[PDB]
Amino acid sequence: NFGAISSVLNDILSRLDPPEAEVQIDRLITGRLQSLQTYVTQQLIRAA
Amino acid sequence: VSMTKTSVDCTMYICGDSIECSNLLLQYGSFCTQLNRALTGIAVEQDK
Amino acid sequence: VSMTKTSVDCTMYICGDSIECSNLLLQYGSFCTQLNRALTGIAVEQDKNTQEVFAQVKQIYKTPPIKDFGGFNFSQILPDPSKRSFIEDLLFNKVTLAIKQYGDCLDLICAQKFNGLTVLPPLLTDEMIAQYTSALLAGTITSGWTFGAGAALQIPFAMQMAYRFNGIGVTQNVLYENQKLIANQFNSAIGKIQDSLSSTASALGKLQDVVNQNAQALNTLVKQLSSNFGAISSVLNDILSRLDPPEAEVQIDRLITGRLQSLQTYVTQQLIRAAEIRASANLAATKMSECVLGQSKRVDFCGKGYHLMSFPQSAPHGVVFLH
Amino acid sequence: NFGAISSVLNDILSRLDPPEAEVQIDRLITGRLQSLQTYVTQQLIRAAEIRASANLAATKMSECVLGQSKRVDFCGKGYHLMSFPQSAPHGVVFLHVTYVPSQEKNFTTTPAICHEGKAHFPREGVFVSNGTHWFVTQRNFYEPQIITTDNTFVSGSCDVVIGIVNNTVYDPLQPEL
Amino acid sequence: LDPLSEAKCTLKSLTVEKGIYQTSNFRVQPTESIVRFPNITNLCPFGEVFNATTFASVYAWNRKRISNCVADYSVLYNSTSFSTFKCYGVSPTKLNDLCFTNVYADSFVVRGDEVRQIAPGQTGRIADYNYKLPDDFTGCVIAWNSNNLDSKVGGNYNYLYRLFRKSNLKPFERDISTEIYQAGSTPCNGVEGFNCYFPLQSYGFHPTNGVGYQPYRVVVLSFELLKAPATVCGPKQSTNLVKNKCVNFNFNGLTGTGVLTESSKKFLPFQQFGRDIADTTDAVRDTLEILDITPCSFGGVSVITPGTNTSNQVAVLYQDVNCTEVPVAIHADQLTPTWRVYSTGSNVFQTRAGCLIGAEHVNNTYECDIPIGAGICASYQTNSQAIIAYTMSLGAENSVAYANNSIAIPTNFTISVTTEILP
Ligand SMILES: *[C@@H]1O[C@H](CO)[C@@H](O[C@@H]2O[C@H](CO)[C@@H](O)[C@H](O)[C@H]2NC(C)=O)[C@H](O)[C@H]1NC(C)=O
Ligand SMILES: *[C@@H]1O[C@H](CO)[C@@H](O[C@@H]2O[C@H](CO)[C@@H](O)[C@H](O)[C@H]2NC(C)=O)[C@H](O)[C@H]1NC(C)=O
Ligand SMILES: *[C@@H]1O[C@H](CO)[C@@H](O[C@@H]2O[C@H](CO)[C@@H](O)[C@H](O)[C@H]2NC(C)=O)[C@H](O)[C@H]1NC(C)=O
Ligand SMILES: *[C@@H]1O[C@H](CO)[C@@H](O)[C@H](O)[C@H]1NC(C)=O
Ligand SMILES: *[C@@H]1O[C@H](CO)[C@@H](O)[C@H](O)[C@H]1NC(C)=O
Ligand SMILES: *[C@@H]1O[C@H](CO)[C@@H](O)[C@H](O)[C@H]1NC(C)=O
Ligand SMILES: *[C@@H]1O[C@H](CO)[C@@H](O)[C@H](O)[C@H]1NC(C)=O
Ligand SMILES: *[C@@H]1O[C@H](CO)[C@@H](O)[C@H](O)[C@H]1NC(C)=O
Ligand SMILES: *[C@@H]1O[C@H](CO)[C@@H](O)[C@H](O)[C@H]1NC(C)=O
Ligand SMILES: *[C@@H]1O[C@H](CO)[C@@H](O)[C@H](O)[C@H]1NC(C)=O
Ligand SMILES: *[C@@H]1O[C@H](CO)[C@@H](O)[C@H](O)[C@H]1NC(C)=O
Ligand SMILES: *[C@@H]1O[C@H](CO)[C@@H](O)[C@H](O)[C@H]1NC(C)=O
């Protein structure tokens, strides 16, 4: 969830107005970006 | 000698098919290109 | 051999001249010191890398005036009265590098400098490195391999080459009966190398990639300041001018978190690249010890064939070996 | 604080209701997770370097202690003779024993000796002179010996060699008997 | 206070070891403040909006336009009292130091209960069929009770609203038609019979009603901030333009700290601000000229210290400043008296790295002790005790006696034992 009401984007979008939905979607975006960046860094460390 | 080469679609991993999420990801500021450059360098190194 | 040394001002990159942002950055908890320690370690390692490869012998031998070496001609690699050789000049011209003053800019470099991103100069200037390489060349062509052990002992050049032919498994008389032909072949090969370097085509892409990578990373840092990171705007003045401090704290905290993440990604990738540069420097120091100071019997270490000798030349951020 | 009202969880919990407390506790959780992840990444980056150094010390244990190495400046400066290991906290120490020549002397030399229209080259060593006599000596130590047909092999003719000189080869057998 | 104090604060310790150290700023603090606002002395009409005798119905709102005025609202304090006032996109304490763009004023009359529906993201008959507000709305909503002016003893039936509509209204859209709503099938054809309704209905305002029924006058103000050339401002007083110093500029409601210089950039008539690659403002129209803002601090500063255990004396290196340009660069004359000493001195040497102040230059070459860079090192030595700066020596010098018929043979040897440490 990363602090949002749910981990599914459809539930957040279906039940909330775009101004309210922005904060939850921003939380999800930050979390998933962090996951991708951790994956990439460990891939570089193994490639070495 | 080598390892597997991978590629990631940043918008499909984070947003899926949601237009609203894609607009928010544009506003947020995307560093997906940097991740892609790192992965492409890894793949070229593996072939070398 | 080495890469560029950089320093970052954490508060100037994140906050600028905003007192309110600085107070919030103090409250937030600052790990800027850890980033600075990592960058300082990188810079010290880069100077150490440069030192190891070139400062191996601390006796500055001088080029011999007589220059009678039995028909072998070294004018293209010995210095010329920044005291660099012909081939070193060609190499320094094939690589295109990337005091700036407040009056000078009042260009990407000053866009970096206004945001806390500075580049530090190396300890050894290029003249010093050229003096090191010329000392190595003089020592090798006068005393052969003896100088490496500890004390230089002069020996005529043809005698050295005879002992190298014995080294690879061919008897002396093969050199002494073919001396002029071998000298001509060596001179022609040096000529071909010079012609290849003077062509437009560049073989120094390995040394150009370092410069491109450094510039790309430092420019990505500056481009990444326009990201809103979920706030109303990416400019601190708009947030401060239009909102009360209690309301402004949440937006400024969002911006602080984003910019801290950007700095931490930059630092981590710099460490990952420094490891690889250190590997390459260690390789070039082993090759300086074993291909230049000695005759190597390892296969394909000092080129393809049976090794006879090697000569070093200095290049921007790196070294070149003629095997 | 990481943007929360305080850095102590008890103050946040004691003064606020669970719905209000969730946002502050989430801020703290995110910050502390980031701290742990930075620690782990830098530990991996250092482990790689320690592994490089360990591999180097295993190659040096195999080649400088178990064998005599001919690589230059691998087992110290000089000509390698042997090495001894000692253990140290978190590491290893090598004592390298090497041979360093000294007390040099200037001599005059030649590529070959011409006896009777035949060139003579040393089998191992170099021809040296003290200014009156010609001898053959080993390269790394001074040990002059009289030139005989067992020190020098014969090949070719005198004309080809640029710096050949004239001298005599002993040919032991015939004069002794 | 000092370069050494900067180093101590940066390192978080009371003792500083031997070494050259990078430092943060701390030295400069802004103290002045300029203001630039347009020449507008025509007060906005707060008498022909709030005091208007007749207000519109909610189904057909006025949508008035405002420009070329100063927006001083304290002139209302004596005359009117507002029961509702809420602002979106801006804080109510900054309203007196900002210049607004594209200002519009919408006006109508609702009942007391339906005031709460004038807000972004609401539902109800007024939000659905009469008046709608955008999700990203910047502006303010004001409402006040008017049971003295809009209520008649017999009843006031001149205010109307829409009750039936096929679909919801979009933001800032109006509908003044009066067709006949068709509840079911069997089209109406204007008969107005059964399942065919006239869509507009009338509020009935009597003086003796509940507070919820009582009439409430509503005004909505719409504007934009810091985007384009503005014309409505706030009660403030322009001040002289102190130039070439670290100040707070506050140009047309945009605040910050910086330095102002002339620019050759040309702006289209609808542009006033300009942003660069890092998205921060660099060019501002002022006279109608375009000026340029530059940060307060520029470049790096380093401190060379032989260690706090030995002495409290230090040297300072400026990396990007040719000497004689140092005082302007580091904004001297605003620094404390101790910090000025370093700006100008007898012990000034220009190195390739930058300018070094506080160290004496010798003509001898020793081994490096503290690397300054570009071939320069520094050391703490007696002469009394001082910090000297010299050029490093690569090593000893000699030559080899080379000759085509000469050799050197060793006669003796040495057994050497050396140590190598590995983690
Ligand atoms: C070693 O090589 C250099 C470079 O070719 C020789 O110097 C040049 O020789 C040519 C001969 O035609 C002259 O025309 C040039 O003027 C010389 N100088 C330069 C800078 O090119 C040099 O003579 C060679 N050494 C020998 C033959 O002993
Ligand atoms: C070079 O070495 C030869 C051989 O050692 C020297 O010749 C000897 O000189 C001594 C001098 O007392 C005589 O007693 C020997 O009989 C000589 N040997 C022969 C074979 O003749 C020679 O003198 C040395 N030359 C120099 C300049 O030192
Ligand atoms: C703008 O006008 C169009 C056309 O009058 C409206 O579309 C009608 O909407 C109703 C409500 O669902 C439908 O029953 C009609 O069939 C639509 N007409 C057509 C031609 O498709 C539209 O609703 C109006 N927009 C707004 C915001 O009211
Ligand atoms: C610094 O100033 C001197 C004096 O005018 C000038 O000669 C020099 O070119 C300037 N720049 C540098 C890098 O020394
Ligand atoms: C050899 O001779 C040169 C000069 O001819 C002299 O400088 C050198 O010291 C001599 N070698 C030794 C070992 O003395
Ligand atoms: C050595 O050089 C001299 C000239 O300096 C020359 O006369 C002599 O013949 C050369 N000797 C040999 C063996 O080449
Ligand atoms: C060696 O002897 C031959 C024949 O006597 C003579 O021609 C030649 O010049 C001699 N060599 C030298 C170096 O004098
Ligand atoms: C408002 O209108 C009334 C009636 O004309 C008038 O008496 C009053 O002075 C006006 N007030 C203002 C502030 O215009
Ligand atoms: C404030 O409003 C009242 C209401 O009539 C008026 O009598 C009074 O004079 C006003 N204040 C001033 C200073 O005019
Ligand atoms: C505004 O006031 C200033 C005051 O000096 C004057 O110079 C200027 O002409 C006036 N008008 C404009 C459009 O700036
Ligand atoms: C040091 O060398 C410079 C350059 O020749 C000279 O101007 C200066 O007077 C010298 N100073 C001393 C103390 O030798
Ligand atoms: C070699 O050196 C040792 C110690 O310095 C000395 O005792 C010995 O006599 C030397 N040998 C010669 C031949 O000089």
Residue numbers in the entry:
A (entry chain B): 969 to 1016
B (entry chain B): 729 to 776
C (entry chain A): 729 to 809, 813 to 829, 834 to 841, 848 to 1064
D (entry chain C): 969 to 1145
E (entry chain C): 293 to 578, 581 to 677, 689 to 728
What does the published report state?
SARS-CoV-2 belongs to the subgenus of sarbecoviruses, for which horseshoe bats (Rhinolophus sp.) are the reservoir species. A number of recent studies reported the existence of sarbecoviruses highly similar to SARS-CoV-2 in diseased Malayan pangolins (Manis javanica) and thus pangolins were proposed to have played a role in the emergence of the current pandemic. Here, we analyse ACE2-binding properties and the structure of S protein from a Pangolin-CoV closely related to SARS-CoV-28,9. To characterise the pangolin virus spike and compare it with that of SARS-CoV-2, we expressed and purified two different Pangolin-CoV spike ectodomains.
We have determined the structure of the Pangolin-CoV S protein at 2.9 Å by Cryo-EM. Overall, the structure of the Pangolin-CoV S is similar to the closed form of the SARS-CoV-2 S and the RaTG13 S; the most striking feature is that all of the resolvable particles on the grid are in the closed conformation (compared with 83% in the uncleaved SARS-CoV-2 S sample and 34% in the furin-cleaved in our previous study). Comparison of the structures of S of Pangolin-CoV and SARS-CoV-2 identifies two amino-acid changes that likely account for this feature. Firstly, an amino-acid substitution in the otherwise highly conserved sequences in the interface between RBD neighbours in the S trimer, likely contributes to a more stable packing arrangement that favours the closed conformation. In detail, there is a salt bridge in the closed form of SARS-CoV-2 formed by Lys417 and Glu406 in the RBD. In the Pangolin-CoV, an arginine is substituted at position 417 and, while it also makes a salt bridge with Glu406, the unique side-chain properties of the arginine residue induce different conformers at Arg403 and Tyr505 that enable additional stacking interactions and the formation of a hydrogen bond to the mainchain of Tyr369 in the neighbouring RBD. These interactions would be expected to contribute additional stabilisation to the RBD/RBD packing, hence favouring the closed form. Furthermore, in Pangolin-CoV S there are also two additional glycans close to the RBD interface. Taken together, these observations suggest several sequence-based differences, compared with SARS-CoV-2, that likely account for the Pangolin-CoV spike adopting an all-closed conformation. On the other hand, the sequence (97% identity) and structure (RMSD 0.35 Å) of the RBD of SARS-CoV-2, is remarkably similar to that of Pangolin-CoV, particularly at the ACE2-binding site.
